[PDB]
Amino acid sequence: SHMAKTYDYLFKLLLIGDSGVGKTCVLFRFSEDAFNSTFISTIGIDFKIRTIELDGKRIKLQIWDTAGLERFRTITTAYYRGAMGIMLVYDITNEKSFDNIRNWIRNIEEHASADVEKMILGNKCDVNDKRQVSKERGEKLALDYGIKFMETSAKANINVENAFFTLARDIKAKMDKKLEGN
Amino acid sequence: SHMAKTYDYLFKLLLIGDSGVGKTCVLFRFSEDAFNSTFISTIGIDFKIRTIELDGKRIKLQIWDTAGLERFRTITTAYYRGAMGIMLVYDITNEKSFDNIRNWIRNIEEHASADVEKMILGNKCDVNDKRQVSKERGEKLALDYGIKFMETSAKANINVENAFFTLARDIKAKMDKKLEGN
Amino acid sequence: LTDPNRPRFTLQELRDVLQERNKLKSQLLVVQEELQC
Amino acid sequence: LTDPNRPRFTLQELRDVLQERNKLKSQLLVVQEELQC
Ligand SMILES: Nc1nc2c(ncn2[C@@H]2O[C@H](COP(=O)(O)OP(=O)(O)OP(=O)(O)O)[C@@H](O)[C@H]2O)c(=O)[nH]1
Ligand SMILES: Nc1nc2c(ncn2[C@@H]2O[C@H](COP(=O)(O)OP(=O)(O)OP(=O)(O)O)[C@@H](O)[C@H]2O)c(=O)[nH]1
Ligand SMILES: [Mg+2]
Ligand SMILES: [Mg+2]
């Protein structure tokens, strides 16, 4: 329909990581500020949209939420090439979902832009009694890869806002230095 | 949102019959007045909406287009209970799709309202050279079941308008005599 | 099992996405009609 | 093969419906935003 747009930037984001780590719940906390405890695993892919403000500019965030289960891999693959930032999510109560982060990283390296912005979320950081992945170990992984990390909880609403704005701010800053230098 | 409606009636219609007889093409001729020759088989179910005028009243038609292929049977079943009129479509160039009409009729008798309005469409009636089902035989089938019949072509646009208005008019007339007599 | 037509997804999986597809199309036609402004 | 979790539909079948679901949701959010009247 070719009408004037109501945003200045458009950031395509991608959440990836194993089934059940809480990717959908983290996005629904960011986009609706709600939390449902019942598991509704993501069939293939879904998306949510939120517009935020950075340095007084309108940033539309088109956030793509992939299925973690193996049978959806070909479907979710199609969504890597366009992403500008990617949340790699694991579950602090599940060591496998954290070991698998380095597989998710290799997946990105195979399918995404060479310079995509990456962040690690250790989610469910409200379930201390069941913790398997120390906070120190998530930090050293992300340091080993030179990318940012934080512990999140969609349920207790911990670091969800901060994760997306930080990733949004880092995409914007790199983009602005590209646009300015062209 | 509880807002004033822009129709006086709402008729839920169902197209059923074998895969490839032209159910989708008949609906796309009714709702868009177009015809595409390439086959895009219907995944499960789809629907189209058109509002027509009868006796000076606004009739919203919510037309449900089922998949004919066997693997979608449980999916399409859910849509029988609410239908008010049903197009049973066969392909004049395919005897099997016409023999199978009496299976489609038994399907209706198992799943739809006892008094649902039924019509037989012999579609592709523009392909004379490949005809297998004589027009006389479609007529005697529909007479055997006391329901209306016509030969249609979505491609040459034959009897598509007439089929839906007639079915719409017969639903409306029976409904009005019910509403009046209550 | 390298076959493109291998059956892979369940009734539940397909029917859920279809039902959402219907709900969205239905809602979109409503808000499109809401535009007589 | 009476099993609810029997695999039944193809990649093509599911991905097509998903892509339409996305297109519809995208269009619906647009026409919803178009309502600041
Ligand atoms: N206590 C707690 N539970 C959570 C949290 N995040 C998610 N959950 C629960 O963990 C389960 C899995 O969460 P989802 O967001 O559906 O997981 P997912 O990563 O989207 O899984 P897939 O779509 O299958 O890839 C759900 O039952 C959630 O309620 C959290 O921060 N804290
Ligand atoms: N010549 C001619 N071809 C037609 C006509 N109607 C449909 N076709 C062709 O027949 C093929 C099947 O038509 P569809 O409408 O897709 O069939 P369908 O009944 O919806 O099949 P399913 O969705 O699989 O149940 C398509 O390639 C059409 O182009 C017609 O009236 N005349
Ligand atoms: Mg999910
Ligand atoms: Mg069809």
Residue numbers in the entry:
A (entry chain A), B (entry chain A): -1 to 180
C (entry chain D), D (entry chain D): 125 to 161
From the paper:
Parkinson’s-disease-associated LRRK2 kinase phosphorylates Rab8a and Rab10 to subvert their membrane trafficking functions in the formation of primary cilia. Rab8a is phosphorylated at a threonine (pT72) and subsequently binds to a phosphospecific effector (RILPL2) via its C-terminal RH2 domain. The C-terminal RH2 domain of RILPL2 encodes a Rab-binding domain (RBD) that adopts a parallel α-helical coiled-coil structure. Here, we show that recognition of pT72 involves a dual arginine motif involving R130 and R132 from the RH2 domain of RILPL2.
Here, we have determined the structure of pRab8a in a complex with an extended RBD of RILPL2 (117–165; abbreviated as RL2117) at 1.9-Å resolution. The structure includes residues preceding the X-cap that were not mapped in our previous work. The structure of GTP-bound pRab8(Q67L) in complex with RL2117 forms crystals with one molecule of pRab8a and one molecule of RILPL2 as the repeating unit. The biological heterotetramer is generated by a twofold crystallographic axis down the length of the central parallel α-helical dimer of RL2117. Although the RBD of the complex begins at 117, residues 117–125 are disordered. The model contains residues 126–161 of RILPL2 and resembles closely the minimal RBD (129–161) of the previous structure (pRab8a:RILP129 complex). The complex with the extended RBD (RL2117) has two well-ordered stacked arginines in which R130 appears to stabilize the conformation of R132, which directly forms a salt bridge to the pT72R8. Strikingly, the newly determined structure of pRab8a:RL2117 reveals an ordered R130 side chain that forms strong stacking interactions with the guanidino group of R130. As a measure of the close contacts, the distance between R130(Nε) and R132(NH2) is 3.4 Å. In contrast to the other complexes, pRab8a:RILP117 forms a symmetric twofold axis down the length of the coiled coil.
